[PDB]
Structures are given as structure tokens and as C-alpha cells.
């Protein structure tokens, strides 16, 4: 009626995404139809709709439209050719420190906007960082994203991809702040610097073991008041690998950024704003312009 | 010998001294994967 299908982009466990073109602006979009008991419209779709309707940033995906018919709906976002995962995994295209800085800058600017609006993207991973041919990174899906301000609200500890989960979520924190997004951002930066998933865990216990053996178990002066979380279990005291050994070719400023994003104390962990103010982003290699960022061709 | 103590000898005959094509992607899934009214 107003959008014509162009390509069969794919599916997620609750959506079917088709590339499409609108007959009003000949702009290429991505339409997302939601599948279908006795509950009504799926809550992930409603969460997408409600959160993305009140955000407008360069670096957050925006649903250009939303509509639907009997018992089912379709959202309409900007069409994003790739994500950061296909850029990471593609061995052909190199990621120089300027390219890494560009991806980090776009991610943290989007997340700083999202956090100033008291919304928490509780699922941040290279798969969910799309980017268009103009090389503008956008935070992809908000089907598990919430508002983190209110005390009276009991959150859930199970919601973020395990590999990009903060230690407090694995310990079962029912209440948390922007530290979950910032830990996932640190893990994204680590995967962006190594091109392989930092801390790939087989379970929550395995994820915690790998976090602790890679960074050192927190000593309660680094993460004071840790022992109070609902699913806290004591761990063997791992020394942790020095950060200038994990990332053997990262500058000192980048190392400070890594250390800030990977602080165990979810309150000492740097926020998007103060991450953006660190010397890393202001130092000599400027971020690449979105026009010069590498695109995985086919 | 010890198939001797391991009973596989039938499978010796059969299996002492094609297959796909013989007996007459997807794997990546296997790694990471009123209707009449409709059409």
C-alpha cells in the first residue's frame, strides 16, 4: 500500500525483516513484521515501539514508521546494510586505531544520549550495532531495554547476551545502572581490538570464571559491597592478565579507556559521558569519518 | 586379535578387507541456525 518489499533480509525469533522502499520518498527502509497466544501484541515489539518513538539521535536506530493489521504489526526502521559483527568477523578488512575509535565514538555517543534519557540498552553487542553505507553506527534493537531510574522497579538479571554481560548481572543484580551498557561497550571494544569475542562463556559460572581469570577477581576494595548480590559465589583469586598484555598494540590512553570500561565496581565504572571526555578520543588519530569506514563488500 | 575378545567379527567378515553417492549451509544451521486463506 505504501511500502514495497525488495529483499528478504532475514528473521529473528520474533520478527521477519524485509528490505523495502516507500512510494513516497524512494528511501530504502527495513520493515520488521512481528509474528504471532491470548496475550496480544508481543511485548518486545511494544518495547521497540515505545522506546524508539521517543528517541531521535544520529546514532540510535529510528523507526520511521509503524503500522499493522489484524493481530500483527510491522515497524519501519532505517535500512542498515551491515552490523558491527560482520565488520569484526570479516578477515579481509582491517580495523585501524582510527576505525576502532570511530566505532567507539559512535557507540558511546548513541549510548550517552540513551543514558541521558534514562533508557538502558540492556542488550549491547556487535550484532546489535548496525551501520549504513554512510558509516553511521546505530544501536540496533531495543526489544529488551528499560528505564533504569526508578527504585520501586525490580529489574531482571538475565537480560543481556552472556558474552557481553557485566559481573553484577551474572551475580544476579536485580537493580543496576548504566554499568551494564558500559561493560558491554568495553567487551565490544575488546572484541573490536581482538576481532574475536572477549570472554566467550559457556555458562554464567563459566562467564564469571573467564571475566575473573582475565581481569582478576575483585578484592572488595575494587568492588566494595560485592558480597551482597543474590547469586554471589566466591571465586579462586585469579591474578588477571595485565591489560597491556591482552591488547598488546593499544595505546596508553586506549588502555585507560579499557580499564575504565572494565572496572568491577558498577559505580566506579566510567559512564558514556566521562568515557567520551577521556584523552583517547581527543588524541592524535582522529576517528575516521563515516565515509572512510570499511564496508564488508558481499 | 582382541576383537576376538571384542565380538566384532561379524563386522570383520562384513568389515574386514559410493557411500554417500552409494546408498542412493544446512550444517551451519546445525552450528548456528486457514493457512489456505493465506496463500
Amino acid at each position: 500500500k505504501r511500502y514495497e518489499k525488495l529483499d528478504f533480509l532475514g528473521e529473528g525469533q520474533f520478527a521477519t525483516v524485509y528490505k523495502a522502499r516507500d512510494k513516497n520518498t524512494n528511501q530504502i527502509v527495513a520493515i520488521k513484521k512481528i509474528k504471532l497466544a491470548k496475550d496480544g501484541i508481543n511485548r518486545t515489539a511494544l518495547r521497540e515501539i515505545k522506546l524508539l518513538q521517543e528517541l531521535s539521535h544520529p546514532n540510535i536506530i529510528g523507526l520511521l514508521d509503524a503500522f499493522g493489521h489484524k493481530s500483527n504489526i510491522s515497524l519501519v526502521f532505517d535500512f542498515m546494510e551491515t552490523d558491527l559483527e560482520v565488520i569484526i568477523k570479516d578477515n579481509s578488512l582491517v580495523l585501524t586505531p582510527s576505525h576502532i575509535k570511530a566505532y567507539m565514538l559512535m557507540t558511546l555517543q548513541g549510548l550517552e544520549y540513551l543514558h541521558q534519557h534514562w533508557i538502558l540498552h540492556r542488550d549491547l553487542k556487535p550484532n546489535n550495532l548496525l551501520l549504513d553505507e554512510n558509516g553511521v553506527l546505530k544501536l540496533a534493537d531495543f526489544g529488551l531495554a528499560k528505564s533504569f531510574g526508578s527504585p520501586n522497579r525490580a529489574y531482571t538479571h538475565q537480560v543481556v547476551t552472556r558474552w557481553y554481560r557485566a559481573p553484577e548481572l551474572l551475580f544476579g543484580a536485580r537493580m543496576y545502572g548504566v554499568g551494564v551498557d558500559m561493560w558491554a561497550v568495553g567487551c565490544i571494544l575488546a572484541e573490536l581490538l581482538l576481532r574475536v569475542p572477549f570472554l566467550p562463556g559457556d555458562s554464567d559460572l563459566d562467564q564469571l570464571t573467564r571475566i575473573f581469570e582475565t581481569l582478576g577477581t575483585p578484592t572488595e576494595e575494587q568492588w566494595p559491597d560485592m558480597c551482597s548480590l543474590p547469586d554471589y559465589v566466591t571465586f579462586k583469586s585469579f591474578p588477571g592478565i595485565p591489560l597491556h598484555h591482552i591488547f598488546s598494540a593499544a595505546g596508553d590512553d586506549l588502555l585507560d579507556l579499557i580499564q575504565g570500561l572494565f572496572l568491577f565496581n558498577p559505580c566506579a565504572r566510567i559512564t558514556a559521558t566521562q568515557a567520551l571526555k577521556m584523552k583517547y578520543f581527543s588524541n592524535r588519530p582522529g576517528p575516521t569519518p563515516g565515509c572512510q569506514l570499511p564496508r564488508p563488500n558481499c | 586379535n582382541l576383537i576376538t575378545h571384542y565380538n566384532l567379527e561379524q563386522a570383520y567378515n562384513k568389515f574386514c578387507g559410493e557411500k554417500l553417492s552409494n546408498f542412493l549451509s544446512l550444517r551451519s544451521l546445525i552450528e548456528k541456525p486457514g493457512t489456505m486463506l493465506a496463500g
Binding site: 511485548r43 538475565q158 552472556r162 | -
Partner: peptide
């Protein structure tokens, strides 16, 4: 070991 998106 590549996992699935976490499930409500």
C-alpha cells in the same frame, strides 16, 4: 558455541 538472543 555461538548462542541465541536471550529470551523473555
Amino acid at each position: 558455541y555461538s548462542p541465541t538472543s536471550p529470551s523473555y
